[model samples]
Target chain A: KGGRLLSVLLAVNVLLLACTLISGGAFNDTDVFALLTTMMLLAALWIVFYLLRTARCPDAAHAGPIWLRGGLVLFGICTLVMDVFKTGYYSSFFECQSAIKILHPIIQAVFVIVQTYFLWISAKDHTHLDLTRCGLMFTLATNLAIWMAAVVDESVHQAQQGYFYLYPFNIEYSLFASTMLYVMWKNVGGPVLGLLLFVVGLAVFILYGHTRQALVIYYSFNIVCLGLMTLVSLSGSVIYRFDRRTLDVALLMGAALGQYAISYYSIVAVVVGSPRDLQGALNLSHALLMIAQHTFQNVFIIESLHWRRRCLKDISLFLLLCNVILWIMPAFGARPHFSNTVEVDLWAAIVNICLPFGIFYRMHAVSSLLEVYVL
Target chain B: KGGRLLSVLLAVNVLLLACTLISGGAFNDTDVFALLTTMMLLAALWIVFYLLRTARCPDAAHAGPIWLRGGLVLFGICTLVMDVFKTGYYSSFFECQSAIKILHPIIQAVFVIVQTYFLWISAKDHTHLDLTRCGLMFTLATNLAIWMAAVVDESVHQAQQGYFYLYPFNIEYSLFASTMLYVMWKNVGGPVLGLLLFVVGLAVFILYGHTRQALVIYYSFNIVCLGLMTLVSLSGSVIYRFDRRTLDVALLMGAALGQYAISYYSIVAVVVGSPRDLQGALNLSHALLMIAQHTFQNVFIIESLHWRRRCLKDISLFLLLCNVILWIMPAFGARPHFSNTVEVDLWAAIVNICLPFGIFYRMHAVSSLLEVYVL
Candidate 1:
């Protein structure tokens, strides 16, 4: 348990370092930036070489809540891989070094291995998930995976073949995930976690599509996946620490705005980058994410809450102000451009900041909740 | 309460009569058709108008268990209204009548009235449906209504400015309806309903795109709507006397097929008559009567089910034989001809006979559980 806890912590920090470095020095360069990037890379490398070896470590008390722990492990690795691939391999091939291509397949293979391990862990844990449930899960997961892959490869396939085949898969996986997560949510006794699971899982797929140069900027999926991840994590940590049995509206609302920000950015980035007949600014994943964000916001603020806490006012006001700012730039004269000062760019900036913050808050929240759900 | 029930019953029957007259005395001559239609219509009307009149109907002892009832009433009305507008008005007009110049506004007004009445009922009952839920239902209704309206107006509007809006609306409505319906199914309790809702919903939408007059056949939506209505009505009637609990798998399965059959013929007889985009073989109401016939068949065959009362070997063999026949029809050259042999048409014919018999057998399967939930 101790080793597992340490490894989890190490994985988290490594992921964070990788994200910071990838988002910074790799994209641009400055004297102070170079030092920060080096520090982050060193940390990430150290953790991966040493801490990742603790894969067989026992379940940690610090594994976080069931709802959140899954997301953290999943997205935490996602973040690490994304950043590493972008900064170390993909970018090097495109700009820094052509030699990075050799490592692409190898790195992807490593991710596949890691992902399979996680899948095994998940499968093992799902004693409650029957054959019907497993079939449903595999079907949906495969669909989403295919869709994401297609987005990346859409320029080559004009017929929407991937979408046709993967769509059924996506639907199936959605059912499987919903069914499994719902069972867990029922056991946990609140819908917050279940909702989050949906959002985060969805976001991971959408974000992958966007960053991988999928046909275009599909914003909603990424927004939903990440927003839900953050919301679940926040709810777990916050509710548990407060010893509350139910989710609060303020956090939910905040998560919604945050998810929107993420989606808004993806759309801006994609629209700025691509112009294609086959792929548009919209993708199902991103649209779903936006919808989920809106839904969760509505539920959290309106459905689940009764406006008793004064602190909630602060949170609501802050979210409202942020939303207005997001809306204002676009509503005014700004257009979405790859560069800053444009609507999409500003929105993207806000999304990058908000999504991570929301995730952090959620991690805290879910951790606290797990404490209660346990002894 | 009784007055409201009576009035609703009278109104529904009168509307049915209007429908029959407008479509030309189609089902009026069928065997015991009047008696069965009236009974079925009365049961349905009671559930919609009186049973749903929360102020008048006594609480199910208390409010908690009644949550399911509330969900039922809300979901039922939404589904019923949408179904009527789509299958009855849209598909019927497009397939059968060429009186678009005369009946367009009248049809539209009638739908508006139905929707207005529904809204009024929701408002009067103090049952709050959120914007998302309401939006989902209304959008679906509007889209179907638009298509119905468009079918009549297209002959006139073909010369007008732009039909882009109408074209997009068709696909949009289908997409929105399918997605929202899926969401609703997630909340509906019965596993049978869940699977059928998705399967048939997807099948119809996709099939509509493939049919000979792919222009006329909106296959799945209407089928699903009728299936739901029939399921609710039959279950209500069954439980009223028998008091059955969870539906027997065979009964549920049989009913599902029956529902599929009714919707199929409704489309075939009305829209795909002779497989022409032009006017077809039977009048619209006759097609409706055919659908009604299947409903009757379902009620007869399954509602009074008794496995041990019959020869088990013969029963199983019969069911197996029916399944085999259905499986073979599509395989052995049941080509997609709007003319005579549609896959759904074949299924409809098989189910048309099977349902009445199935209902009769299953009727006695659950004596007590039926009454509690159904009545």
Candidate 2:
């Protein structure tokens, strides 16, 4: 009854929030932000109290590895950086907006600090908490609501915020932290190559992100990345023919929820954009490549977890880094949410709804690969 | 290799056709029709050939009970009636439209007949098939594609051809028949009071279907039906507190996919229409009733499977009948696909994409409840 009760409420809140998110005009963002702040504070208070109470409690498989833990810390630090920037940015604008605007960043900054310490200490602890599980869920939902708000605000409001650049870090921090919590809570559990390529991609994006050749070069670049990754994933999956996990299964299926949905939507958009042109061709290939690439990578990751023998550990590291770059690109400014060029309210609504999880898919992948690489 | 290969390919084709379905502009119904017809014919050929060869086969609960088998047969017969009418009606337009127009239904009619006979003989057999599984996938996909085509055409064209009348029977036939196949293919495993009220509801719909009094009455009628069902489901679930299954888990989850998607879409739509009116309030209540009702019912059906003592068989029969009327409402012509006056492309696209499975959920609910009762 406890699980079922929580499940229903969680589903209801999610559905209600989703309705709120989709209607766009149904509720003001301020209320959503207000609701979010309260949930964040509730979650933080629980974490603090739960820690004090449990002084307390613990992991079965060492559910995570150093890389995953380390990445979250890294991501959490960036989240603070963003939150700090936001609080500072908004402080000067107190007259322009509401006091809550400045207040929110500080609250969120504190929330991130609490979350990082909590995750760092307990990412692998299966504390078997019930009412406590409710607390975990609120934290997860708050992070998600925060993520959703960011998507709607970022996409609709676009990039002048510059604080928007670090927003992905906070967003990924939510996903990665949640990924670790998932490993602990249910308990179970993405990595980093990504940086170098991301820098280069940024250079390309800066120089040509909107220039005449931007879309074409960007499409080919991503296509090549996905294609190469697919090849490696194939090799990795093949190695698994030679192997022999729970959260592993859950993440693959759960994360795939948005991964497939987002890429598939773009696939449709490009086809509509149609032969129709060269970019259309490239865009279609990019999406197609993505669909295949994710599945193959998905197959490899799940297989790696179980194969008792060997892994292409090298491939795992490669995937880890590759996922990092993809995350970096989307997290920074090359957002499909902001940049879709296609004018579709439905698509716009859908993207706003689905894009965070798509990014989380990468975040989760990185975390899972960290487990494979180390364990 | 076999499962993974088929899995990836099936997903790709599904995604591609989904793209085709969503784009409304990228390809004509003609090509989608052509692709569907070939697949239907191929599926038909494979079913005939495989059944002929394996006329030799076998379920480990007897994966199905007579009620499911009987229901599929009943639905199948109506499917034929619809097909016959379609072929007849479209014949009048052979010169006015593509010959494929008339031809498609005949092909589909034959496909239905083959599928019915196939399901009838082997809906319990778990003869392990690989390439044969491919055939099954195609048949399932063909049924889905046909359903998708119907949703688009029905919603966009709205009901005049009159043959659209039997369309729901065919649609449910797809769902119910597929439900049976799912049990047989992987092997595992709803009922009736639904009819009497369905006829009465039809009377109401016919009398005031478009009348102003109609919206209020219809909304209230539905709310009451859902309210009654939810209460009974609560009772049924309570009785389950007093019972213990595999395919049972799968159906609850698999069917919920579209069941939740469709209802939640309406929930949001109703909210978007906002506190703004009386119909709006009524519509919002209807969606809320539906979400709670479906969840309560889902809990009852699943819990009934495991509890050792008793099921409220009386409640089972009641739910079964209630489900039938609900199915009948949408099946006969009270279609959300066709009736949604909200008028947005994305919503329309989403509804078209998601509606069949919602109907199938009812079909599956009936099939599963039958198992709960009789077994």
Candidate 3:
């Protein structure tokens, strides 16, 4: 072990010396700031070299997510266009431009081209490297940060001169692509809800679409539903044989009730303020989303309660939090749906009539869920 | 299934009607808002009842993480103190205070006490429930949100007239306690550098502590180290015999070099501008943190390269991101160490000299990691 350590150190020292020579006084010159430039160049070269040897036999064509590749291609084209513009603009100011300034867009163009091709073909190739996914995320983050910085610079330039450019879209597209790529990298290749609670949820949404007075209904529904849900869930706790109950159940119950309260209120407001004669189809679609969210959320909670799987717990919690945020916006006085030709009193009446059932179903689910846990 | 669903619905409806009756005009009349008050009272009573029943037959004593329980106790005590003050203050204006206002402190006090006790006895019990862990997280979040709201309200109240209070700490402690509890709940119940790389990382830290003139040495070292590391890792990628290289390796290489360039420049700045005559111990500790971060990060990468375990990949990525953040703060011109009595230049010099190897090691690790992926 000691010998190996010493050998590795020696080898490292030799390599370090060689690298210093290659930098060609680049390190000593403060004006010659091309560290990142050099690294980018090297990365591009490495990819080229790897491709050359493996070019004879490419991996399966259909590997990574289609969206990721599509995004890369779309962003790549935009970036190329921006680079062309940048080069043209900078060339006009050739005498005044710094070498670094002239070189940046050119190098960035190369980086973008190489990266797009690389990601398009190899997104699904999950070969392990030390800090693999993290490194990808870091690279993406750097690209994003750089792109954002450039955009900011461009924004300032545009504002100063009262001009606009297409590069901003290019940078944005690049950022989006990089982010999606990172998500694909992080995907673990793994991947539920019923509908009764959903329709009830929809009724609440429709009500919220029309009225501000729905806050009272929503809060009341939540108070009652949450109270019932908590009590029912609590019953299971009372019967549980374990020495201690997991905190998850408590959180889930809280989230569901919290979600119910907020959605109920928001729906009432929507129904109260929205156009009463709006397209029925649009309303139907909106109701479906609302119902789906509620039904799925409730079912998720019930399943997690029953199975106690960690993955399920994660998913359920995520959904619950998301649902709450949906409610949270309206609860905190966001009125995106307030200006409408709908009748407030009518929607409030409908919400008051229908929302109670949604609340009831959730509580009922919890009761049965509790019984299952107890047994 | 139909019968079960129907029965649950019936039980739910019954509970709903009961809840409505219990609301008892509370919706229309603020005087009757005792619905929540009553629930709080009953919850407190239930706790007392449960405690009485289980008082003689308590199971295993230890339940949750020490920090969580300790925080709860700490926060609970502060809340009690706040309650006492609130009661005393409100009683003075008993005729004018809203019932809700009067009820708030009393109920909150009970909530704190009961929750503390409930958590204390049952944090570890993994009883299955619908949306178990999600529910727990949701509950914790709500509790946290409520606690935060209360604290914010108190802050606003205190800020208006410059009054100081203990309730802020109470809420903070509660938040800390709950967050820690959630972490404990999520615990899966499971639960690295080359030497030459080590010495170089060491050199950067030590040199930065002593001299500002060491920047040239640091920069030169980084150029050599990073270059060598990249080349070596590149060799490994070449030897790898996979049909195609993974996108991860390319990204990993890019990140390592990119990170190197950034840190190299930052260290240079630190060496150039930071105080040299600062307290030796403080400088030493600071240098140690920097060196430790680099060494551990590089070592982690190397290990991940060798083992290629999924979990290791996760950990290594996390560490890399954290280390990058460490670099980020300094690189972005946050000179936390600049104002010391010590010669900023000398310390920066030392950092410049030593930090290259750390950068080199990470790159080296990535290269080898890439090679391994290819192979």
Candidate 4:
């Protein structure tokens, strides 16, 4: 049973890799890298649809109905394809500013629709993982509100300071994080651990965000911050019968829709002489992209990722350490440089580039390793 | 057991009313009947203080460390006295604008000292009601931040909006408000009820204030909103064993201090040629004042008043119902008139008057009835 589970998990992981490839996930140096990445991502998304076809792989589907699994996979792929493509395409077209403003209507529409869909889905089922859904909804809502505030704020040039809404948006993101922590902690039967994680995570994010002005530092810390939160959310979700409902599909498709909107803006921002602003914006978008990708992966992992006793213990400890470090970094003001700052020398460049990228690489390596092992 | 609980609760109620009175329990008017009511409240405050002393009846030599209680009483009396004196005495001494600007220093001094005292007291205690004390602290911090905002904001006005630091300060107030709600909801139970009362009180006051600009409606509704929040905080606390800390006293005194600040400002506004601008200034100040009073009364009630079942339960429900209505009204577009119709009545003065006064009567009657029956 264990080996069977492991095999299924491995297959899911492999499938995710395939999906990643198909969606234009692999990168190249040409101008067409953007398009290729988008296309690859779109193709990779198909694995999500394929995995959800419980009839083909009942073990991986975890007793979820074929229709539900298929629907979730399709929706997931759709979101993935759409989001990835937009990111690539928009990067090619617009700079961040004009893109952000012009895309406002589309963003608002997606925001309202996505958030409402989540609310509707959450209302229908009081799942243990509902907090994650709620937090996601909240994040989106606050994102929209912050965007609205940025749009309305008259002090600075609305266009120039438009992206500054991210500052407040990050604050709202903390809501999702804290809520996710609580849900995770509760599900794990460790409210104290949850509280600790929440307080620590919160302390770290807030401390850094307030103290620093660097782009690399800002984006790096937040991406890691949210990356941690997503992991918790993914791990915390209990293995249960998956039922693909319209709301679920709505959520999936809505995410895809949102990505398209954001990437569309990113394109605008880059084209409009404000590509520098894209650093934070890019980090945020990429963080979200990663979350979506991981979610797709986790849907498979839950079915297949089982560890041997000793390895399980080690993995758990490692995860816990990562969690602790997340809390600690903020407590200590170890910061990466802002993306806008050009490193004058090799040393400065090395330090600036390495800090955030190092953290990102570590996190990615861990999750990716887990992904491979599960498959 | 139930009867004993009831008696204990009643005794606590009477004692709380006593503390409230000594702790600035004056019913002074905001304007129009301001002077007369100020004097009445001053006298009533002392009466309650004396009555409380006799009831608690500690020995004369060691009247149970009167600094906390005495300081509060003095502040309350002085605040009320200042308001009374301001109406007539200061009229000749200073012009309205001059008095208004100068009052900022005095108000800041009052708040600074009050908060410092609270910090001192909270630091000294270990076994205090955690949520109530913390909630009170949060309230004080936010109020302090608000005052700081006001000072900087006023400074900005001096520079004619050339400065932008105060914009951040304004945003901070909204953030504090958002934080305050979370703190209230998370730390205090029955936020739904408290929120409900706030919504109702807000609706009525907004309506009444906008419709006829009735001072009575404005002030009375504020008290109701504060009163309901106080109950919410009270419900979260284990009041009987409360340590009667100096911070508790400070919070109450601070609230009364705030009232004085407002009346003090009103005097200044009345004197100034820019009395017209007082509408906006007063509205914002009054809202802050109402919120402060709520925090003050709540912390005081929980620390001094033992738990009362009927009042807590009833008020919670009342607040909940009102909150629902308050929220519902906004959705239905029965929002406060913003344009003020250039110069016209929006609603009948009678109906407009009824809502706020009704809330006031309800709050006043509830508090008064508790005093008589509980004692």
**TM-scores of all candidate predictions against the true structure:** 0.23, 0.75, 0.41, 0.24
On residues A245-336, what C-alpha lDDT tens digit does candidate 2 reach at each position? 56656666566656566666666666545546576677677777887887788777666566543447777887777777676565555344
Best by lDDT: 2
TM-score for chain B in model 4: 0.26
Question: Could you tally the backbone clashes for each prediction?
Answer: 66, 27, 67, 41
> Looking at model 2 chain A, which ten-residue stretch has the lowest summed lDDT?
A185-194
Candidate 3 lDDT over B309-338, as tens digits, reads: 443333333333333323322322312244
TM-score of 1: 0.23
Q: What value does the lDDT take at residue A278 in candidate 2?
A: 72
- Residue B273, model 3: lDDT of 47
Lowest summed lDDT across 10 adjacent residues in model 3 chain A is found at: A188-197
lDDT of 1 by residue, B223-323 (tens): 33434444444444444354331233233333334334433444434442345434243324333533443443234334434233223223222322232
Model 1: how far residue B219 lies from native, Å: 20
In the range B1-375, model 4's lDDT, one tens digit per residue, is 122222222322222222222212122211212222232233333333333433442311112222333333343344334434444344445655544434433443343344334322322211222323333433433443332333332333331221222222222222222223233223221435545455555565456424445644654554465555454445433433333233333333332332333232232223332335435444544444444434433343433333445544454454435434433322223212442221112222212212222222223223432342344
